[PDB]
Structures are given as structure tokens and as C-alpha cells.
Amino acid sequence: QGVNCTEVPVAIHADQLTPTWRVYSTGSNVFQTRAGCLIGAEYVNNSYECDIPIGAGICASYQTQSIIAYTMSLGAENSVAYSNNS
């Protein structure tokens, strides 16, 4: 949360407070959101209803099977055939 993740711990033997469960950065779909940096989720261009809220309009889900991140959809488009004699 709130990390540019260009400063994410590359790590050698011990330079991170988390108890040394380093997750691979380059090869595990690092993504940058306004809520921070997400590791282990693939960003897709589709849009579904929110499943797990990440933040700033970004949600995550388990689909395909892997974890994906996307922008939530507010609903299905609809247009009313307005006229002034109908």
C-alpha cells in the first residue's frame, strides 16, 4: 500500500521487515495502482462486477485458473427511445 514498487525489496538475504517470503517481481505481473503495487495478478482489459475490492476502481477475481485484476463495471448500457409524441 502506497508504494511506488520501484523501491520494492529486491532482497539479498535480509533487507525487508516481512518475514522473508519474497514474491518474484519481474515475472509475476507487477502492476501499479493508485492504492499501491499489486504482485501476482494479471491486469485485463475486460470489465466485470466487483468481486474483491482493491481500490480506486480496481477489483480482483479468480477466473480463467488464475487471479486477475480489472476495472469494475457500473452496469449494462441502456438507452430510452425518447420522443415527444410517443
Binding site: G2, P53, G55, A56, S79, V80, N85
Partner: protein
């Protein structure tokens, strides 16, 4: 009796806060700072800050719930027709503007503008373990929801709030709403231009009033202010000694022996923990207040925007006609359109009419006299008519009603039969 002879279309505003700022606290960094040896003593106090994290997470989830329950009341995203003719009503001041990149209305932009190299305050607070979490819904999404609600209420009336959206011309919808407050349809159909002009002028006056005055949104601004101050105080509490020799623990540790350093660090830790607990309690109380306000806003969205309300003074001052929503930073603004009587006149009135030994009462209106002659009119608008058997009903004789008067009730059948 006094009967109005004219009317006015009024537009008023109501501002309601919806959501609060979501904050997060790093307990170890706030209390012991960067010194890795102070944190060892913190473990001897139990699970003191897991409760803090739990409460703050609950508040953060509740804020998103508030926003969702206020603004996400539409199943589909309705789109306004490309042609913006609605019988003379303009609506251009509340519809989204496509030229601007924000896709916001001329009034939403003003609202967002109104509500608000040395280290910034945000960075200074962040360097001590206090952070702000972004909301789930962005401003663009809330603007989209508001636009969908506006398009639905302009194209379908109140039908889209109870099922499938059914199209209806705007003049006919306004006639329905006039019928809803006890005024006949021909009153609107014979004054369409005047009513449209009055509505447009009122919308322009809302424009000018919101643009000129700068203290109208103090309800929302307070919500912002009460947050910032609450954080600032916390930071200031880091500069108090709480009875110790100094407020810097590195100096204490590099200065003297553990036997007294224990007491110094203990009193510092107790003071910091007390400050954090007080902050959390105040946050919980303020969250309850915000939740009540958001519930009221959701009820008003359901009952004033998605329908026509008969409750007095719930959706403005006067007889409610309709309502339009707009989004504002951390809140919502309702524009209420209401009907106000004007230009009343004096008349003499009677409760019943005596004719042929029978008492007649008006079916819908009231009996009035201009000085020599008697008519029957609707209650909210002066429109005299000849008293016939088609707008009256008979009950009993004239010996029971107090105040009955003598007049003639015209039978439409006799002239047609004799001709």
C-alpha cells in the same frame, strides 16, 4: 376564503455529507519511531493495536458501503437522447458536459471547485505512520451514476424506479406531476411557456447563487476540516514529554542507564497509547454520525428523485414536483423543484347549496361568490365554473347544514330535451 390566482416554480438546494476519509495508522512507527530497540518493549503490552487496526478497517469498509448505498440505485446506465428538446425546458446546466475531460455538469464543476518547496502536511503526517486510503469509487464513476439517474428521470419519469423504464413526453409527465398535487392538467397545458421560463430562470438563479456565495457548502467543508485537525493534533502529541526527561527516545537511550530509561520509555509509551485510543474513539463516534447522514441521503434519493413525495417539507419548501441529484466532494446535492401559490384573492364561501329542498355539495372543489353570483372552483387555483348537477352531489335537505345558502343548480338535460 382566499384562493390563489397564480403560481411560482421554485428551485432550492440541499447538501448532505455521505462519506468520510479512510485513515490507517502504523502503531509501532507512531510510538517507537525508527529505534529498533524501543519496539521490543512494546511487545510487553498485549494485543493493544490489533483492536485499533480492526476498528479502523471497519470504518473504512463502512465508508464505501455508505457511498454504494447512496449512489448505486440504478440497474442500468441510462443515456439521454442526442436531441435535447424537452418541450421548452433547458436542462443544460445539470446534464454532463462532453467538451471537458471530466464529463461533469456546469454545477458539479463549481461544487468541486468550491470545496477544498517545504515539506507538505500530508508528507509530514505520512512520515509518522498515518496514511490515507483511496475510496473504492472514483469521482468519474459517481458522476456516471448521477448522469444515469438524471437521464432516467428525464426520459421515463418515475417508471424506471419501479421496473421497466417507459418513455413519456416531458410535458405529459409534468402534467401528471401537476395532477399529483391537486391541480388539473389544463392549468399546465395552457401555461407551458410561462412554466418553462420560470424553471429556466430559477435554474439560472441557482447558477448565480452558488457561483457568488462562498459559504454555502460549509456542511461538506466541516467534514474535511474535522479530519485534518484530528490528524494534526495527533502529530503534536509526539512533542510532549509526559513527565519524562525528553520526548526523544534516542537521546534517552544514549544518555543514561536502563534502570531509569525503563521508566522514561514506559511513561512515553503510555502517553502515546492513550492518545491513539482517544483518536480511535472520536473516529468511531464521527463515523456513526456520518452513517446516519448517509442513511438520510439514501432515503431522500429513493423518495424525492425516484418518485413524487407527499410528505411535507421532505423534498423542499412548497408542493414537491421533482428533484435532481448532483455529486459533490464527500456528499450529494439535491435540487428540489416545487410549486408555490401566489396572488390570492378574497371570496365569500358556503358549505352547501339549497335547491328544490335539497342540499348540494361540491364533488371536488369549493363554492365561491364574486359578490353577486356563485361558482365552484378547484381549491389550489381560481377557475370559476357554473354550478351544475355534474360537479355536485345531493345529501339530505337544507334543515341540517349550518350556513347553507339559496341558489340555482343548472340541469344540462332540460335544454337538450326541450330542443
Amino acid at each position: 376564503i382566499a384562493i390563489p390566482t397564480n403560481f411560482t416554480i421554485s428551485v432550492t438546494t440541499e447538501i448532505l455529507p455521505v462519506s468520510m476519509t479512510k485513515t490507517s495508522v502504523d502503531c509501532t512507527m507512531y510510538i517507537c519511531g525508527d529505534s529498533t530497540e524501543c519496539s521490543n518493549l512494546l511487545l510487553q503490552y498485549g494485543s493493544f493495536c490489533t483492536q485499533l487496526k480492526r476498528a479502523l478497517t471497519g470504518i473504512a469498509v463502512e465508508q464505501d458501503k455508505n457511498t454504494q448505498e447512496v449512489f448505486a440505485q440504478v440497474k442500468q446506465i441510462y443515456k439521454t437522447p442526442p436531441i435535447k428538446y424537452f418541450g421548452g425546458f433547458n436542462f443544460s446546466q445539470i446534464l454532463p458536459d462532453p467538451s471537458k475531460p471530466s464529463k461533469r455538469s456546469p454545477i458539479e464543476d463549481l461544487l468541486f471547485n468550491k470545496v477544498t518547496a517545504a515539506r507538505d502536511l500530508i508528507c509530514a503526517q505520512k512520515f509518522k505512520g498515518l496514511t490515507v486510503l483511496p475510496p473504492l469509487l472514483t469521482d468519474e464513476m459517481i458522476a456516471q451514476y448521477t448522469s444515469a439517474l438524471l437521464a432516467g428521470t428525464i426520459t421515463s419519469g418515475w417508471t424506471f424506479g419501479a421496473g421497466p423504464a417507459l418513455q413519456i413526453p416531458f410535458p405529459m409527465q409534468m402534467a401528471y406531476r401537476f395532477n399529483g398535487i391537486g391541480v388539473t392538467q389544463n392549468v399546465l397545458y395552457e401555461n407551458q411557456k410561462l412554466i418553462a421560463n420560470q424553471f429556466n430562470s430559477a435554474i439560472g438563479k441557482i447558477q448565480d447563487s452558488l457561483s457568488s456565495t462562498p459559504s454555502a457548502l460549509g456542511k461538506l467543508q466541516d467534514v474535511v476540516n474535522h479530519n485534518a485537525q484530528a490528524l494534526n493534533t495527533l502529530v503534536k502529541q509526539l512533542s510532549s514529554k509526559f513527565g519524562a526527561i525528553s520526548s526523544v527516545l534516542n537521546d534517552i537511550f544514549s544518555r543514561l542507564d536502563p534502570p531509569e530509561a525503563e521508566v522514561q520509555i514506559d511513561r512515553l509509551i503510555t502517553g502515546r497509547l492513550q492518545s491513539l485510543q482517544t483518536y480511535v474513539t472520536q473516529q468511531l463516534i464521527r463515523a456513526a454520525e456520518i452513517r446516519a447522514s448517509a442513511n438520510l441521503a439514501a432515503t431522500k434519493m429513493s423518495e424525492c428523485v425516484l418518485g413524487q413525495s407527499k410528505r411535507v417539507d421532505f423534498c423542499g419548501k412548497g408542493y414537491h414536483l421533482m428533484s435532481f441529484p448532483q455529486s459533490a466532494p464527500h456528499g450529494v446535492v439535491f435540487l428540489h423543484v416545487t410549486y408555490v401559490p401566489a396572488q390570492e384573492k378574497n371570496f365569500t364561501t358556503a358549505p352547501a347549496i339549497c335547491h328544490d329542498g335539497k342540499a348540494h355539495f361540491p364533488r371536488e372543489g369549493v363554492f365561491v361568490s364574486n359578490g353577486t353570483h356563485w361558482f365552484v372552483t378547484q381549491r389550489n387555483f381560481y377557475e370559476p365554473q357554473i354550478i351544475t348537477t355534474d360537479n355536485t352531489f345531493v345529501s339530505g335537505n337544507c334543515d341540517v347544514v349550518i350556513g347553507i345558502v339559496n341558489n340555482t343548480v343548472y340541469d344540462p338535460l332540460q335544454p337538450e330535451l326541450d330542443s
